[PDB]
Design a protein around this ligand. Structure first.
Ligand code: NAG
Ligand code: NAG
Ligand code: NAG
Ligand code: NAG
Ligand code: NAG
Ligand code: NAG
Ligand code: ZN
Lengths: 596, 195
């Protein structure tokens, strides 16, 4: 018997063993997230330990089958995912310290609190304390206090720890034959051994930066319009030619510009489309919302929910003594168990969240037939892009009118349409320069291109140039402002929000084209189009069994990430902004700062 | 008027595991096939070499009642000319099989919140099973080329596994009880007839 056949039998034993053991961890995790006791934390942690210990044992066993002697690519995919040494390639002495810093910085971010001037007894955490100010306060100084205090009392705590974090992660990455920890993160998109569909880790940087160049015209005009409106609100603090102050961007870091809609709405006399009243009018409930979402996916050919979904899901807040984690999640426990955890209220927001999280379920159900290790999105950005495109179609006035939540004789005008796209761009487009710049800084730090004594200088140099955002207070190298965001100090990749954003609009355009949608992209609804659903299904069922380039081709007809569909979506806003900025400055000066 | 002991077969308290499937001889009795339908829409009743509507006006010899438990997706393998882990290694019907295959969901009996680990099935074997062959050996399967020496190790697997039935499982993984009747049609002195 060959080494390839031995690996097939080994993965056969693993596939059966993993499905039972992962189910226990999923069920114990579910019981805690639906019933918060101390007993359930123990049951959740114990199952999580047994699952983690199991993977480590099978990671060692899989390494006794060298990849260079296996020809079936699908087997090589499963073995490579299981053979990942990870941070166990270090010594048991350095491994223990890395966890000590990862668990320390996580504690600092989650439990770091700041107290006001002349009020020590009172103190505010990040959530909800400081996030409330950065999202709702319209005062310059109060926002500046929260922005600076968070970065100089908690961010500085993280600065020495991040330096050690960079040294150990790089050592771990190089021992696993990667250039740096950034190269290790880019390995999610790597594809080898398939002619025409391959993809190198370095090619991700080229593709991201080439695509981001075509975003610059749209972002510059959005940035120019936002600055002009913000200048009216804050006349004495905002330059018409400079970067936007970092503490006036709607949240703590300017990751999204969503909360600037109140100050930047073009036409404040034409109300937004909020069917929340109409859902209350017809006495809808949580079951009806999810029942309507089920009908949507059936309308495009996808299957209806399993009866176990209705029986085992938690679709309403249990209220009373039973506490539950209300963040909307879609669970794939395996063995046919599919659930959604959601404290659903009867609102248009939760209505679209149901279509989103239910789209995750359809993806989960589609690749259920795959082997265990191949049950996931094509790459890190695929799964969420599938979720977002459902709320795109479900929120259009076309879809809302068809389901009797919007009056049939409803006339859409270009003013309410511009208001909607401006809201969309503040969230979807605003994050892209922020996301690319942040991961670019992390990429260069891990590469060594940025030395320790210039971390914060290069960080704010790149904020000024790429994002058009300037710090309100000069920061030396005692700060660590990137660490002030969750994803950095809690050790998560961040480029996924860039790629997924571009993926979701490639999906929507290709599906809307299959549905023969006539008109602008943003008004499209793929409902009642089985042709669009079939094209989507041909990718969902793949899971991880194929390169993500092939999976993307099965939807959009191209093998690489493309930014033109995203620009197509915002075309009515782009041409409106260019006329809106005809008397304004477009671009920014990097050497203007609010602190003179 | 000895009514054939189908009550023993279908309404037994516990069924056997599919790898160690049970076999019950049925002879010298009247086989009334009209009262199997006394199950919660028992999902499957498929006959081969015969037609189910005529069943309770025929006469057969060599009647055997086989019974075990599998999951929903594996029910499709209890049929002539099928392969898969159940057909290959646990219970195999011949190509020219003459009989009836009866199966129904038993989630309310064979499932457990903490998991039902009563029922087993065989995962590895040297070769496929001949029709109606039974193998209950616990010998360690050798997947490599060094001898396993009767010990579970690397490339050395215990041949059996458990079904781990939980009621929250999907239909495909929920337990299904199966009864497979085997008879020879219109032969010899005709021990089992029924109405
Ligand atoms: C929540 O868990 C406790 C045990 O920790 C249990 O007594 C209680 O019944 C559970 N609540 C529900 C609604 O199941
Ligand atoms: C890889 O193995 C699977 C199952 O062992 C098989 O179905 C598939 O055809 C194989 N592919 C190739 C290219 O050999
Ligand atoms: C799903 O639809 C099928 C028919 O297409 C039907 O037999 C089944 O009962 C449905 N299940 C649910 C939960 O609605
Ligand atoms: C889909 O078809 C049904 C059939 O009556 C119709 O009521 C519904 O409005 C249609 N939806 C769309 C988006 O055309
Ligand atoms: C709406 O469209 C018409 C097209 O003739 C144009 O005259 C009007 O200025 C537009 N208004 C906005 C706000 O786009
Ligand atoms: C099993 O018991 C039910 C009543 O519990 C009865 O109706 C049915 O006929 C029995 N099955 C057989 C094969 O006798
Ligand atoms: Zn999601």
């Amino acid at each position: 018997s060959t080494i390839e056949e031995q690996a097939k039998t080994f993965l056969d034993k693993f596939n059966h063993e993993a499905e039972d053991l992962f189910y226990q961890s999923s069920l114990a995790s579910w019981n805690y997230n639906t019933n918060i006791t101390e007993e359930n934390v123990q049951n959740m942690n114990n199952a999580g330990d047994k699952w983690s210990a199991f993977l480590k044992e099978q990671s060692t066993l899989a390494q006794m089958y060298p990849l260079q002697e296996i020809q079936n690519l699908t087997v090589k995919l499963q073995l490579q995912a299981l053979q990942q040494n990870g941070s166990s390639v270090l010594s048991e002495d350095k491994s223990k310290r890395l966890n000590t810093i990862l668990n320390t910085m996580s504690t600092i971010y989650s439990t770091g609190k700041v107290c006001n001037p002349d009020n020590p007894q009172e103190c505010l955490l990040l959530e909800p304390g400081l996030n409330e100010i950065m999202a709702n306060s319209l005062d310059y100084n109060e926002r500046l206090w929260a922005w600076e205090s968070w970065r100089s009392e908690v961010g500085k705590q993280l600065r020495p720890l991040y330096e050690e974090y960079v040294v150990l992660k790089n050592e771990m990455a190089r021992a696993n034959h990667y250039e740096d920890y950034g190269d290790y993160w880019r390995g999610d998109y790597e594809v080898n051994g398939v002619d025409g569909y391959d993809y190198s880790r370095g090619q991700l940087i080229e593709d991201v930066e080439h695509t981001f160049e075509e975003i610059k015209p749209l972002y510059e005009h959005l940035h120019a319009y936002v600055r002009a409106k913000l200048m009216n609100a804050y006349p004495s603090y905002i330059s018409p030619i400079g970067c936007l102050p970092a503490h006036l961007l709607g949240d703590m870091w300017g990751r999204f510009w969503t909360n600037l809609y109140s100050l930047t709405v073009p036409f404040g006399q034409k109300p937004n489309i909020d069917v929340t009243d109409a859902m209350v009018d017809q006495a809808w409930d949580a079951q009806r919302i999810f029942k309507e979402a089920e009908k949507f996916f059936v309308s495009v050919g996808l299957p209806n929910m399993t009866q176990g979904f209705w029986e085992n899901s938690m679709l309403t807040d249990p209220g009373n003594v039973q506490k539950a984690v209300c963040h909307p999640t879609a669970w794939d426990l395996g063995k046919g168990d599919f659930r959604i955890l959601m404290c659903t209220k009867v609102t248009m927001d939760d209505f679209l969240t149901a279509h989103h999280e239910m789209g995750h379920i359809q993806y989960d159900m589609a690749y259920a037939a795959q082997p265990f290790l191949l049950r996931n999105g094509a790459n890190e950005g695929f799964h969420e892009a599938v979720g977002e495109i459902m709320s795109l179609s479900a929120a259009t006035p076309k879809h809302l009118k068809s389901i009797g939540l919007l009056s049939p004789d409803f006339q859409e005008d270009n003013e309410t349409e511009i208001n909607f796209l401006l809201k969309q761009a503040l969230t979807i487009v605003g994050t892209l320069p922020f996301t690319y710049m942040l991961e670019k800084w992390r990429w260069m730090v891990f590469k060594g291109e940025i030395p320790k004594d210039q971390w914060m200088k290069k960080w704010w140099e790149m904020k000024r140039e790429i994002v058009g955002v300037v710090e309100p207070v000069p920061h030396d190298e005692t700060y660590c402002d990137p660490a002030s965001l969750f994803h950095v100090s809690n050790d998560y990749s961040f480029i996924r929000y860039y790629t997924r954003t571009l993926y979701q609009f490639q999906f929507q355009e290709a599906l809307c084209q299959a549905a023969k949608h006539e008109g602008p992209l943003h008004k499209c609804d793929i409902s009642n189009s089985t042709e669009a659903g079939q094209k989507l299904f041909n990718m969902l069922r793949l899971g991880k069994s194929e390169p993500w380039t092939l999976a993307l081709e099965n939807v959009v007809g191209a093998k690489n990430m493309n930014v033109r569909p995203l620009l197509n979506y915002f075309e009515p806003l782009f041409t409106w902004l260019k006329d809106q900025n005809k008397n304004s400055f477009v671009g920014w000066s990097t050497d203007w700062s609010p602190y003179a | 008027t000895n009514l054939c002991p189908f009550d023993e077969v279908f309404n037994a308290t516990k069924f056997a595991s599919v790898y160690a499937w049970n076999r019950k001889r049925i002879s010298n009795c009247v086989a009334d096939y009209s009262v199997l339908y006394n199950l919660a829409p028992f999902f499957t009743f498929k006959c081969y070499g015969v037609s189910p509507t005529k069943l309770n006006d025929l006469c057969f010899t060599n009647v055997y009642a086989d019974s075990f438990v599998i999951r929903g997706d594996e029910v499709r393998q209890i049929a002539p000319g099928q392969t898969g882990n159940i057909a290959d290694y646990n219970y195999k019907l011949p190509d020219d099989f003459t009989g009836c295959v009866i199966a129904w969901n038993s989630n309310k009996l064979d499932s457990k919140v903490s998991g039902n680990y009563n029922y087993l099935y065989r995962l590895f074997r040297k070769s496929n099973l001949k029709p109606f062959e039974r193998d209950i050996s616990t010998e360690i399967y050798q997947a490599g080329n060094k001898p396993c020496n009767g010990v579970a190790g690397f490339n050395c697997y215990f041949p059996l596994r458990s079904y781990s039935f939980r009621p929250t499982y999907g239909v495909g993984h929920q337990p299904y009880r199966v009864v497979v009747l085997s008879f020879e049609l219109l032969h010899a002195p005709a021990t089992v007839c029924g109405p």
